[PDB]
Write an enzyme that holds these catalytic residues in place. Structure first.
Site, PDB file in Angstrom:
ATOM      1  N   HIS A 241       0.943  -1.081   0.000  1.00 24.20           N
ATOM      2  CA  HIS A 241       0.000   0.000   0.000  1.00 24.20           C
ATOM      3  C   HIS A 241       0.978   1.122   0.000  1.00 24.20           C
ATOM      4  CE1 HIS A 241      -3.394  -2.372   0.188  1.00 24.20           C
ATOM      5  NE2 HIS A 241      -3.581  -2.454   1.492  1.00 24.20           N
TER       6      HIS A 241
ATOM      7  N   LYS B 219     -11.713  -0.607   5.935  1.00 25.81           N
ATOM      8  CA  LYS B 219     -12.763  -1.609   5.734  1.00 25.81           C
ATOM      9  C   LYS B 219     -13.834  -1.844   6.788  1.00 25.81           C
ATOM     10  CE  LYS B 219      -8.621  -3.786   5.927  1.00 25.81           C
ATOM     11  NZ  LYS B 219      -8.311  -2.332   5.892  1.00 25.81           N
TER      12      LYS B 219
ATOM     13  N   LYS C  28       1.870  -6.752   2.722  1.00 25.35           N
ATOM     14  CA  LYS C  28       1.112  -7.875   3.240  1.00 25.35           C
ATOM     15  C   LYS C  28       2.046  -8.967   3.654  1.00 25.35           C
ATOM     16  CE  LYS C  28      -2.752 -10.885   2.226  1.00 25.35           C
ATOM     17  NZ  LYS C  28      -3.019 -10.454   3.625  1.00 25.35           N
TER      18      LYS C  28
ATOM     19  N   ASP D 108     -26.411 -18.036  24.751  1.00 26.12           N
ATOM     20  CA  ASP D 108     -27.032 -18.907  23.782  1.00 26.12           C
ATOM     21  C   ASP D 108     -26.694 -18.482  22.380  1.00 26.12           C
ATOM     22  OD1 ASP D 108     -28.938 -21.035  23.009  1.00 26.12           O
ATOM     23  OD2 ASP D 108     -30.155 -19.350  22.302  1.00 26.12           O
TER      24      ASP D 108
ATOM     25  N   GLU E 209     -24.507 -24.304  27.086  1.00 21.16           N
ATOM     26  CA  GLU E 209     -25.231 -25.467  26.638  1.00 21.16           C
ATOM     27  C   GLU E 209     -24.404 -26.721  26.628  1.00 21.16           C
ATOM     28  OE1 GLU E 209     -26.500 -25.108  22.643  1.00 21.16           O
ATOM     29  OE2 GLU E 209     -27.360 -27.130  22.594  1.00 21.16           O
TER      30      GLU E 209
ATOM     31  N   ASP F 243     -33.978 -15.066  20.715  1.00 24.77           N
ATOM     32  CA  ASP F 243     -32.620 -15.435  21.096  1.00 24.77           C
ATOM     33  C   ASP F 243     -32.346 -15.006  22.528  1.00 24.77           C
ATOM     34  OD1 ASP F 243     -32.431 -16.461  18.563  1.00 24.77           O
ATOM     35  OD2 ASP F 243     -31.341 -14.748  17.749  1.00 24.77           O
TER      36      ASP F 243
END
Length: 1209
Positions: free
Chosen positions: A752, A761, A778, A825, A918, A1163
């Site tokens: 860049h 972004k 990168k 949950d 859960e 939910d």
RNA sequence: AAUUUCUACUAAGUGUAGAUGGGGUUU
RNA sequence: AAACCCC
């Protein structure tokens, strides 16, 4: 707070990885003296030397077991259940046990050279002599002195086995596996000798060893008489199956000779079994690991290119399915289908629905044996059923379905689908195929591979169940002989799949490193000052920069000569002192014959050290205890190596109840970290000359351009050498320096450019575009060579607050008047939802974790990970569910889970709360766009792991919850299946009836309103107490007693009047108003609904359509969760029943309220009720006495749940 | 699009927020 | 080939 008591509970250890940057001329000198070339060479030859080490292991095995003709137990073993002995295998089973055990024992005792096989000597001497290739011996000699590399290899090439069972054992392989196929050796092969004529036997003996008399005991029944161990596993197989000599003609062994009777004369005696070869080598080695994948041309499609044998077995199983009709004649019952998930799939395929088979089985259970408990036992028994015969399924056929022939249709369809992608993959297979844009950018070619692979894999997975549980009695061997052959070759495709997938989904770089030793096999083996000339490695420190100094071989005492520079700069060298394990150190070195002089102990005390007196038993008493303590105490005073190093301030011997109280002091006080000074100038000159090799221990938080919160591993490291650390975090020994080389080229990285705008972004970032004065690349780190320092640490090595965590939590929860619980949950429109309730069940806080708010400086930036996932899921739809998109999704999910772990940790600290999650080892969830079971299991593991030492990075390290006083509120992770009751603060609860329940009444629909028949619908209508129309409120009221209906035992109130209130989304989507449509159905069929109880009039109708539509409006009325798939704005939960104040719950009347008292969505209901199931458990603890709190069952049943739910409101 | 490493980043300008046990050994 | 050793 209840969290505060959970500090210093137990010991844990971590490895902090860092970057080591060569300081000064270190790299120039390292390169001039070629110090990494032999380390790299070793790492490249490691695998090749292991291959040669295995060549010796093979020769050992084939010279020991090839002499072992023991059979001392019995050369007969004719007690093989031919005539079941001792009271129907009572003590006969014990005689079979002892036989097995003793034979394996014989074959297994330390053999003819077990010593110099798994120690240094093999690489040092044995292997060099055995090998006769100069270069092979050279590889082996390059590992001389560095044989510690093979430690784990040694502990699996020997120590995977011993005198036990398991496939790893060579004796298991020879006795408990190969003698099983050799037990079929004395009964009827001579009766099958009708086909095996004299000339045939002589022909094959003249083809094999003519010395071998005949074919002898071969393939019949009863007992054994010749092989036992290994009497030529391949020789046996050469004539059991078939071999080719040099003739070229395939010399039929005896299996093809049996086929003459089976084909030329058509008889039905089956084929025989070949002896399992000793696992490749004898116990290990690798066949289908087929590696090498580093280029886009390696492996070259082992589905029809490299392995046409995979294609060959598609045709093999195709034949088997057309032969299914004749397998009916020879045992169709013998064909079993493994009971498991595949049984539900096979039900849908053969019959119609997934539950057909299950219902047909439960019906038989209902003939002999509908309560909640009853159904538990029913499923328990169904799960225990290992497999279902095909005939059993033909009996469970509801009507005129031929299970076997129906199956045949399904499998032929599947093989044809494989062939469809085989037509589409011809270009890829062509030798003249050209790879255009790699195989990491050619998504068309990747797709071709994936699709074929998937077709093959799916056929294989479906056919897998056609085996059965493995150990059945009737098992048509004419099916299960060739099936097993083909399916074993098909199973190989799981490897090929994974390998090709992993090449395509790989990261563009490599993380391959090699261990550096600096020509010292004991490099960095500890940090002891006494062995600084052996480890030749120390940690220096200048200011806030930390260093790793490595002395040279020739100049190992170099830093020991350097003294301080009062006026000038100074590096601080660490003075690391540690007594490693007083419980063993002290006894070993003080009872020793060397120490039988200074503080000589007598042989009576040597037997105290030997027998088991001082250790445990009823021999341990105060006599030995105090005497030994004092002897050790004073011999430590006589030991200058331990006395000057650590001033052991002890207490009186009388105070010490056991020897462990004393040893605790020797561990706590037997550790010191100090920092002596050294002239910086001289140290730097050593670095210049090549006498020292300095590296800076570094992570991005050691940069001077770094300003925020450090990584926690940086704080851990920096506190190792701190003054407030008093042993809470110790530097364990075992550090390793590695070298990961570059994998990418700097010029080929995505830059860049400087002073050019770069788009931001995050959509929820107020700034878009960034512009930097420099270039940003990168993966810059993988374009350069890196040294990786891995440093082991020991947290809480001397635990002081030792108690059972689970019990202590229960006791503290039983005594907390307001215990808070965080229910978590996974939802459909939310990735995760959090509802915190208090002791009485009042929602204190409810929110989605869809968005994660990061807090840098004073600014908070939100990141919606749900939108991120939606974007990536759109990118999974485009690019037909390709491998990369699903890996990106999984990596995003794992990274999101890391942020959520932090959020949950903060809630625990804010509310002193217990978590409620859960149990994932029970029920299921749908297609919630959220954490699936795999990622939720990783979340729970990561949550346990974090709570083994829960630290806040932004707290004072010496405060509770700070890096040196973290909270250990869970116990160490064992398994995913061990997460089922309590792990500490984490309570795992079943999630049945937690979402589709009414939060204000407790109502759950236990009715089955699916239309079955007119008669069943009339039964349904008349099972209601009254179906009327209340005209005042304009609501049809359906009074109900659940007792008049089936499987409703869990309900507590039983009497509920349902009302047709509000709207339901009929997902067929349409917002159906219920009252209106009931009226409309009634008006359509001319039923006066205003005539009081209309139940009889509804039953006076006859058209099946009225009944079906009353049944569908019934279904809708009972649908609480109403959500449009797509439009996310519309999702709600609506109650058919009113509460005490006469209101029906609507989640839509709560989503706007900021501090809602009831769930705001569906939910939120899940998480609320997950936390209320733990609140039930806390009340259970509260009722019991503290001694039996650990016995309190915390598993809620649907009955106790529904009582709690229906009576707390 | 920078990282001990991973995920999200740019987050205030060579970085930010969280998390982060490594190493052998198993077709 | 999932869990198995040593840290």
């Amino acid at each position: 707070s209840k969290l505060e008591k959970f500090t210093n509970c137990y010991s844990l250890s971590k490895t902090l990885r860092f970057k080591a940057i060569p300081v000064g001329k270190t790299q120039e000198n390292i390169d001039n003296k070629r110090l990494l070339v032999e380390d790299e060479k070793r790492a490249e030859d490691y695998k090749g030397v292991k291959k040669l080490l295995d060549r010796y292991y093979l020769s050992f095995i084939n010279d020991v077991l090839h002499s072992i003709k023991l059979k001392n137990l019995n050369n007969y073993i004719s007690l093989f259940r031919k005539k079941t002995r001792t009271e129907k295998e009572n003590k006969e089973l014990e005689n079979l046990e002892i036989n097995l055990r003793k034979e394996i024992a014989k074959a297994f005792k330390g053999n003819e050279g077990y010593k110099s096989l798994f120690k240094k000597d093999i690489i040092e001497t044995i292997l060099p002599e055995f090998l006769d290739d100069k270069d092979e011996i050279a590889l082996v000699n390059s590992f001389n002195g560095f044989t510690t590399a093979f430690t784990g290899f040694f502990d699996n090439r020997e120590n995977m086995f011993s005198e036990e069972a398991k496939s790893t054992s060579i004796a298991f392989r020879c006795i408990n596996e190969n003698l099983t196929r050799y037990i079929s050796n004395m009964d009827i092969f001579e009766k099958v000798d009708a086909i095996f004529d004299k000339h045939e036997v002589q022909e094959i003996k003249e083809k094999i060893l003519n010395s071998d008399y005949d074919v002898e005991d071969f393939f019949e029944g009863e007992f054994f008489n010749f092989v036992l161990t290994q009497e030529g596993i391949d020789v046996y197989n050469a004539i059991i199956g078939g071999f080719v000599t040099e003739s070229g003609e395939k010399i039929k062994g005896l299996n093809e000779y049996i086929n003459l009777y089976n084909q030329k004369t058509k008889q039905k005696l089956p084929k025989f079994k070949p002896l399992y070869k000793q696992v490749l080598s004898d116990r290990e080695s690798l066949s289908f690991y087929g590696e090498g994948y580093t280029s886009d041309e390696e492996v070259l499609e082992v589905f029809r290119n490299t392995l046409n044998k995979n294609s060959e077995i598609f045709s093999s199983i195709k034949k088997l399915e057309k032969l299914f009709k004749n397998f009916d004649e020879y045992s169709s019952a013998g064909i079993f289908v493994k009971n498991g998930p595949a049984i539900s799939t096979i039900s849908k395929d053969i019959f119609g629905e997934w539950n057909v088979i299950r219902d047909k089985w439960n019906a038989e259970y209902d003939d002999i044996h509908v309560t909640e408990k009853y159904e538990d036992d029913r499923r328990k028994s169904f799960k225990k059923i290992g497999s279902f015969s095909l005939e059993q399924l033909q009996e469970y056929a509801d009507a005129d379905l031929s299970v076997v022939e129906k199956l045949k249709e399904i499998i032929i369809q599947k093989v044809d689908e494989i062939y469809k992608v085989y037509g589409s993959s011809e270009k890829l297979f062509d030798a003249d195929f050209v790879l255009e844009k790699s195989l990491k950018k050619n998504d068309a070619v990747v797709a071709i591979m994936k699709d074929l692979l998937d077709s093959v894999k799916s056929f294989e997975n479906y056919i897998k169940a056609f085996f059965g549980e493995g150990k059945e009695t009737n098992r048509d061997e004419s099916f299960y002989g060739d099936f097993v052959l083909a399916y074993d070759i098909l199973l190989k495709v799981d490897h090929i799949y994974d390998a090709i997938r992993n090449y395509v989904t790989q990261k563009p770089y490599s993380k391959d490193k090699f261990k550096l030793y600096f020509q010292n096999p004991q490099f960095m083996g500890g940090w002891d000052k006494d062995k600084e000339t052996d480890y030749r490695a120390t940690i220096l420190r200048y200011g806030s920069k930390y260093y790793l100094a490595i002395m040279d071989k020739k100049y190992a005492k170099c830093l020991q000569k350097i003294d301080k520079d009062d006026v000038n700069g100074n590096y601080e060298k660490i003075n690391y002192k540690l007594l490693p394990g007083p419980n063993k150190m002290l006894p070993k070195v003080f009872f020793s014959k060397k120490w039988m002089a200074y503080y000589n102990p007598s042989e009576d005390i040597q037997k105290i050290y030997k027998n088991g007196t001082f250790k445990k038993g009823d021999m341990f008493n105060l006599n030995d205890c105090h005497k030994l303590i004092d002897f050790f105490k004073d011999s430590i005073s006589r030991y200058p190596k331990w006395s000057n190093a650590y001033d052991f301030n002890f207490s009186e011997t009388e105070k010490y109840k056991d020897i462990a109280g004393f040893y605790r002091e020797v561990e706590e006080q037997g550790y010191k970290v100090s920092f002596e000074s050294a002239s910086k100038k001289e140290v730097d000159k050593l670095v210049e000359e090549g006498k020292l090799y300095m590296f800076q221990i570094y992570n991005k938080d050691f940069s001077d351009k770094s300003h925020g919160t450090p990584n926690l591993h940086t704080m851990y490291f920096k506190l190792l050498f701190d003054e407030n650390n008093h042993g809470q975090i110790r530097l364990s020994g075992g550090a390793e320096l590695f070298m990961r080389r570059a994998s990418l080229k700097k010029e080929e990285l995505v830059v860049h450019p400087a002073n050019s705008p770069i788009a931001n972004k995050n959509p929820d970032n107020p700034k878009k575009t960034t512009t930097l004065s420099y270039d940003v690349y990168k993966d810059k780190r993988f374009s350069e060579d890196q040294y990786e320092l891995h440093i082991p640490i020991a947290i809480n090595k001397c635990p002081k607050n030792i108690f059972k965590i689970n019990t202590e939590v229960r006791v503290l929860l039983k005594h907390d008047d307001n215990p808070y619980v965080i229910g978590i949950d996974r939802g459909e429109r939310n990735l995760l939802y959090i509802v915190v309730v208090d002791g009485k069940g009042n929602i204190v806080e409810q929110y989605s974790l869809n968005e994660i708010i990061n807090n840098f400086n004073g600014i908070r930036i939100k990141t919606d990970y749900h939108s991120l996932l939606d974007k990536k899921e759109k990118e999974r739809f485009e690019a037909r569910q390709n491998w990369t998109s699903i890996e990106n999704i999984k990596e995003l999910k794992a990274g999101y889970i890391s942020q959520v772990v932090h959020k949950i940790c903060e809630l625990v600290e804010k509310y002193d709360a217990v978590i409620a999650l859960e149990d994932l080892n029970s029920g299921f969830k749908n297609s919630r766009v959220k954490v699936e079971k795999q990622v939720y299991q990783k979340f729970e593991k990561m949550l346990i792991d974090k709570l083994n030492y829960m630290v806040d990075k932004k707290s004072n390290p010496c405060a509770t919850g700070g890096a040196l006083k973290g909270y250990q509120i869970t116990n160490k992770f064992e398994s995913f299946k061990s997460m089922s009751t309590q792990n500490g603060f984490i309570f795992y609860i079943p999630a049945w009836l937690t979402s589709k329940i009414d939060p204000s009444t407790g109502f759950v629909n236990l009715l089955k309103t699916k239309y079955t028949s007119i008669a069943d619908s009339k039964k349904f209508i008349s099972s209601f107490d009254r179906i009327m129309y209340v005209p005042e409120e304009d609501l049809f009221e359906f009074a109900l007693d659940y007792k008049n209906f089936s499987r409703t035992d869990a309900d507590y109130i039983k009497k509920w009047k349902l009302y047709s209130y509000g709207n339901r989304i009929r997902i067929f989507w349409e917002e159906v108003c219920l009252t209106s449509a009931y009226k409309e159905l009634f008006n359509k069929y001319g039923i006066n609904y205003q005539q009081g109880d209309i139940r009889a009039l509804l039953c006076e109708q006859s058209d099946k359509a009225f009944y079906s539509s009353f049944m569908a409006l019934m279904s809708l009325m009972l649908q609480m969760r109403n959500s449009i798939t797509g439009r996310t704005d519309v999702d709600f939960l609506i109650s058919p029943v009113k509460n005490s104040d006469g209101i029906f719950y609507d989640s839509r009347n709560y989503e706007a309220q900021e501090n809602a008292i009831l769930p705001k969505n569906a939910d939120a209901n899940g998480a609320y009720n997950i936390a209320r199931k733990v609140l039930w458990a806390i009340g259970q603890f509260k009722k019991a006495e503290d001694e039996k709190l650990d016995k309190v069952k915390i598993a809620i049943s649907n009955k106790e749940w529904l009582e709690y739910a229906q009576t707390s409101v």
